[PDB]
C-alpha cells in the first residue's frame, strides 16, 4: 500500500531517501498486535481511530486525554491517516495527567500494569508499549521498563528531547529497552534530540502531523513523536512476523537506514527507522 501526500515521517520511514510523499506499507498494517500508549489518554472517539483505541486504565479521575499528547502519539502509531500501523489496536493507560506529567511510581505502576493486563487480551501478534515520556535517570524507572520489557512487551522509549546524552534520562537509559531519537525531514538529527551510546535508533520526530483531541489534528515535534513511529514500526513488523517483542529493537536497528542522518555525534548510532517495504 501507499498513502499519497502521507505525512513526511510516514513517507520517510518507508523511504531510503528523504524527500518523498507517499507512505508505503504492508496492508496487514499492525493488525494482530497491540500497542499500549502509556501516556495522557487517547481520545478513543477520534474518527481517525475508527474504534480501535480504548482506555484500559487511568491513574486519575477520568480516562479522557485532556491534553493531546497521547491522542497524538496514539495517532502516529496507528491512526488511519497519521499512522505507521493503520490497523493496530491501541489501549490507553493513562499515567500522565492532562498537563502531561506523571509521578515515577504511577508510571512504574502503568508499566507493571500493562505487563499484567496484556495477559488478558487478545494481542496475537505481539505487544508493544510505547512510552513517549521520561525524566531524570531512575533505576526503578529502568527496572520497571526492563521488567515490562522482559515480561515480553516491546518497550519503545523516547531518548528525550534535551539534545543531551540520553544516559542521565530514564527509560531512555534502560539499555534493555529501545530508546528512540528524532530526525527532521532533511535527515538531520532533530535539533532537540538526545543522543548517546544508549540510543538504538532514530525516527521522524520533527514537525509531525497527527490526531489531536476534539477530533482534530496537529503537527508537533519531539523524540515523543519518533517513539510512536518505532512503536508502530515495531508493531507493524511483529504482525509482519519479522521480529519479536524481545528483539524488535535490534532488528529495527540492523535493518534501518545507516549513515544517512546528519548531525550525529561520534558515539551515537547513524540509524534511521525503516520498514523496507518492498511492494
Amino acid at each position: 500500500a501507499a498513502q499519497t501526500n502521507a505525512p513526511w515521517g510516514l513517507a520517510r520511514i518507508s523511504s531510503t531517501s528523504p524527500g518523498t510523499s507517499t507512505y508505503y506499507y504492508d496492508e496487514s498494517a499492525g493488525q494482530g498486535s497491540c500497542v499500549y500508549v502509556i501516556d495522557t489518554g487517547i481520545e478513543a472517539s477520534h474518527p481517525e481511530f475508527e474504534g480501535r483505541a480504548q482506555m484500559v486504565k487511568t491513574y486519575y479521575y477520568s480516562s479522557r486525554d485532556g491534553n493531546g499528547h497521547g491522542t497524538h502519539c496514539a495517532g502516529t502509531v496507528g491512526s488511519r491517516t497519521y499512522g505507521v500501523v493503520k490497523k493496530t489496536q491501541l489501549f490507553g493507560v493513562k499515567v500522565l495527567d492532562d498537563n502531561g506529567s506523571g509521578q515515577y511510581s504511577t508510571i512504574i505502576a502503568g508499566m507493571d500494569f500493562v505487563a499484567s493486563d496484556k495477559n488478558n487480551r487478545n494481542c496475537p501478534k505481539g505487544v508493544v508499549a510505547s512510552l513517549s515520556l521520561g525524566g531524570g535517570y531512575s533505576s526503578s524507572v529502568n527496572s520497571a521498563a526492563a521488567r515490562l520489557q522482559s515480561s515480553g512487551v516491546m518497550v519503545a522509549v523516547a531518548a528525550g528531547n534535551n539534545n543531551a546524552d540520553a544516559r542521565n534520562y530514564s527509560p531512555a537509559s534502560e539499555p534493555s529497552v529501545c530508546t528512540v531519537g528524532a530526525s527532521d525531514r532533511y535527515d538531520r538529527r532533530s535539533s532537540f534530540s538526545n543522543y548517546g551510546s544508549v540510543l538504538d535508533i532514530f525516527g521522524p520526530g520533527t514537525s509531525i502531523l497527527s490526531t489531536w483531541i476534539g477530533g482534530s489534528t496537529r503537527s508537533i515535534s519531539g523524540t515523543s513523536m519518533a517513539t510512536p513511529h518505532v512503536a508502530g514500526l515495531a508493531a507493524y513488523l511483529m504482525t509482519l512476523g519479522k521480529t519479536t517483542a524481545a528483539s524488535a529493537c535490534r532488528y529495527i536497528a540492523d535493518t534501518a537506514n545507516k549513515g544517512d542522518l546528519s548531525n550525529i555525534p561520534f558515539g551515537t548510532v547513524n540509524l534511521l527507522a525503516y520498514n523496507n517495504y518492498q511492494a
Binding site: 491534553n67 493531546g68 499528547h69 497524538h72 500522565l96 492532562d98 498537563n99 502531561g100 506529567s101 506523571g102 513517549s132 515520556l133 521520561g134 525524566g135 531524570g136 523516547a158 531518548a159 528525550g160 528531547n161 534520562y169 532537540f192 508537533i220 515535534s221 519531539g222 523524540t223 515523543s224 513523536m225
Partner: peptide, 8 residues
Amino acid sequence: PAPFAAAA
C-alpha cells in the same frame, strides 16, 4: 520531568 514533547 515528562513530555518528551508537545504543547497542550
